[PDB]
Amino acid sequence: GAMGSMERASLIQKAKLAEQAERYEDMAAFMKGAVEKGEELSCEERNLLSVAYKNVVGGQRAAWRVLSSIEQKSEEKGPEVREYREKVETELQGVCDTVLGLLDSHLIKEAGDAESRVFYLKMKGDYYRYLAEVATGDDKKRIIDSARSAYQEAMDISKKEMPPTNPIRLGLALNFSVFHYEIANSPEEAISLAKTTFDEAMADLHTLSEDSYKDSTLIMQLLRDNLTLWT
Amino acid sequence: GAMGSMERASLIQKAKLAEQAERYEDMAAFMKGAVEKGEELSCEERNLLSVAYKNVVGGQRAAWRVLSSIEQKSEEKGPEVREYREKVETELQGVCDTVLGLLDSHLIKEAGDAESRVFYLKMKGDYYRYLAEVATGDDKKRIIDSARSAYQEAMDISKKEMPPTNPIRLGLALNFSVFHYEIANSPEEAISLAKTTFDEAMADLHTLSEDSYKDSTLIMQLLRDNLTLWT
Amino acid sequence: RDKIRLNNAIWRAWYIQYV
Amino acid sequence: RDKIRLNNAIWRAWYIQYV
Ligand SMILES: O=C(COc1ccccc1P(=O)(O)O)NCCc1ccccc1
Ligand SMILES: O=C(COc1ccccc1P(=O)(O)O)NCCc1ccccc1
Ligand SMILES: [Mg+2]
Ligand SMILES: [Mg+2]
Ligand SMILES: [Mg+2]
Ligand SMILES: [Mg+2]
Ligand SMILES: [Mg+2]
Numbered sequence: 001g002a003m004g005s006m007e008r009a010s011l012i013q014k015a016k017l018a019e020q021a022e023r024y025e026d027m028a029a030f031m032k033g034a035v036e037k038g039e040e041l042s043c044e045e046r047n048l049l050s051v052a053y054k055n056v057v058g059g060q061r062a063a064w065r066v067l068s069s070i071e072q073k074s075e076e077k078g079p080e081v082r083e084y085r086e087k088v089e090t091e092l093q094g095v096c097d098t099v100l101g102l103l104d105s106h107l108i109k110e111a112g113d114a115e116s117r118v119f120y121l122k123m124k125g126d127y128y129r130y131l132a133e134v135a136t137g138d139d140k141k142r143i144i145d146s147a148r149s150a151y152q153e154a155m156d157i158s159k160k161e162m163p164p165t166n167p168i169r170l171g172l173a174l175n176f177s178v179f180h181y182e183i184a185n186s187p188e189e190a191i192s193l194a195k196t197t198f199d200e201a202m203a204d205l206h207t208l209s210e211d212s213y214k215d216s217t218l219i220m221q222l223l224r225d226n227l228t229l230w231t
Numbered sequence: 232g233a234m235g236s237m238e239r240a241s242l243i244q245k246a247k248l249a250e251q252a253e254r255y256e257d258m259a260a261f262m263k264g265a266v267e268k269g270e271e272l273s274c275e276e277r278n279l280l281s282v283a284y285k286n287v288v289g290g291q292r293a294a295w296r297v298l299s300s301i302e303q304k305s306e307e308k309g310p311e312v313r314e315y316r317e318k319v320e321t322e323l324q325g326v327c328d329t330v331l332g333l334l335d336s337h338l339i340k341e342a343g344d345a346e347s348r349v350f351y352l353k354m355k356g357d358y359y360r361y362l363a364e365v366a367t368g369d370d371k372k373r374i375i376d377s378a379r380s381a382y383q384e385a386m387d388i389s390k391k392e393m394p395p396t397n398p399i400r401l402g403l404a405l406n407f408s409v410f411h412y413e414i415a416n417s418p419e420e421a422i423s424l425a426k427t428t429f430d431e432a433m434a435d436l437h438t439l440s441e442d443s444y445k446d447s448t449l450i451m452q453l454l455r456d457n458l459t460l461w462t
Numbered sequence: 463r464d465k466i467r468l469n470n471a472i473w474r475a476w477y478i479q480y481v
Numbered sequence: 482r483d484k485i486r487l488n489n490a491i492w493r494a495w496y497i498q499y500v
């Protein structure tokens with residue numbers, strides 16, 4: 001890899017600079033370089049990894065959505081709208097595969113604490129979810145089951161090892177509920193999960209400091225917003 | 232070039248799709264491919280070329296500004312902030328050089344109508360201006376004179392061949408006034424140009440249709456906003 | 463927080479409107 | 482138009498504040 005010659009600390013430093021500059025492609029390349037040093041990632045570093053790739057794939061998804069809609073709307077268009085949509089799709093799949101590769105080599109393997117293991121399995125579920133959004137048919141089924149399996153393992157650990165207000169646990173539940181609604185054709189599961197997650201978090205807010213309270217209630221608000229949209 | 236196998240019409244079509252998707256890097260690569268077909272560009276195509284590269288270099292400039300400020304603020308930092316700022320700088324210079332290359336091969340050469348020739352010379356001034364923002368010393372002087380020369384030729388043609396409300400003429404004057412203020416250490420020239428441009432455009436608005444009026448007054452408003460900032 | 467909530471709502475609403 | 486004017490003002494103001 002092209003980051004092989006750069007110090008791990010320098011890669012992390014530059015990932016933070018790239019974040020400040022909203023240079024998310026660079027940020028992701030720096031964090032990929034950091035992961036490929038072979039050492040575990042700290043909490044802050046895990047967040048940098050996620051922010052980088054979530055923003056990269058977010059841009060790709062947004063573009064894919066613009067093009068997909070144009071495609072579906074097409075007077076004979078020629079092959080160009082399809083071609084360009086496929087170009088973006090392929091690039092998106094490439095980024096997902098890169099992330100999935102990092103998590104499989106060897107972030108998940110070496111993650112023993114709940115905070116890291118749940119985080120990485122949530123990511124695994126997320127990037128399979130993004131692959132699922134652009135997939136068709138039988139390939140879609142396997143991708144969807146890969147997402148489900150990762151989220152489910154993360155859910156099982158989070159329920160055992162983390163309080164109901166833990167932001168990682170909450171963001172996992174949020175995303176798994178989105179998976180149910182948008183990917184798995186399971187709106188009732190989505191709603192049930194979001195509601196139970198919200199209610200169990202509400203009942204644990206009393207334990208929290210001002211700062212932790214703010215972190216937890218943000219994700220709770222997102223659960224509630226989704227519920228309002230879905231009901 | 233990698234676009235060498237794609238039809239010119241397909242490149243233009245995809246540039247418009249990329250614009251809709253805010254995929255400006257793609258848009259610029261498609262338009263570069265189109266220019267490299269060797270034919271002149273229509274008015275709409277010239278605008279696509281400009282929108283693409285202005286947005287690409289705009290992102291690079293914005294990032295450079297974030298990093299430059301961090302750099303100037305630096306407890307011993309190590310070489311990383313400088314290195315990353317230099318990386319962005321080099322990429323920015325690369326994009327400017329690409330644009331300048333397209334204009335020199337052979338857009339300006341073949342541009343005989345005022346609307347095209349002024350447009351391309353304004354672009355030439357702009358991309359030299361962007362190179363000037365990150366330049367130092369003697370290299371800076373030559374770059375600054377290259378910008379000035381291009382803008383000046385464009386100005387001379389625009390005054391001879393276009394009415395004072397022509398949006399291309401107005402945008403050229405706007406940008407040349409910015410060059411004077413920000414690059415050439417000539418704030419009085421900047422102010423004088425913006426004012427004279429505004430006043431001569433005001434006196435020609437009466438000739439315009441509703442639609443042309445809206446186009447002209449937008450750039451006039453930008454001249455006035457700049458004047459307010461500078462005075 | 464408003465911005466985060468707004469951005470989330472846009473993304474989620476797209477799916478619903480797509481159908 | 483407001484957005485175009487706002488975006489322009491931000492870019493121009495940066496130079497002034499940079500000095
Ligand atoms: O704002 C969105 C909308 O959706 C996306 C937009 C871009 C990229 C990815 C996704 P998503 O994975 O589909 O949710 N989501 C993030 C919600 C969130 C905010 C703060 C803390 C935790 C979660
Ligand atoms: O909004 C900006 C601020 O500045 C830039 C931001 C990004 C890229 C380039 C530049 P600039 O070349 O330095 O002006 N400028 C464009 C102003 C304009 C709007 C509409 C019509 C004509 C002109
Ligand atoms: Mg080392
Ligand atoms: Mg495909
Ligand atoms: Mg249950
Ligand atoms: Mg042909
Ligand atoms: Mg340099």
Ligand SMILES: [Mg+2]
Nearest residue numbers: 420423424427
């Ligand atoms: Mg004069």
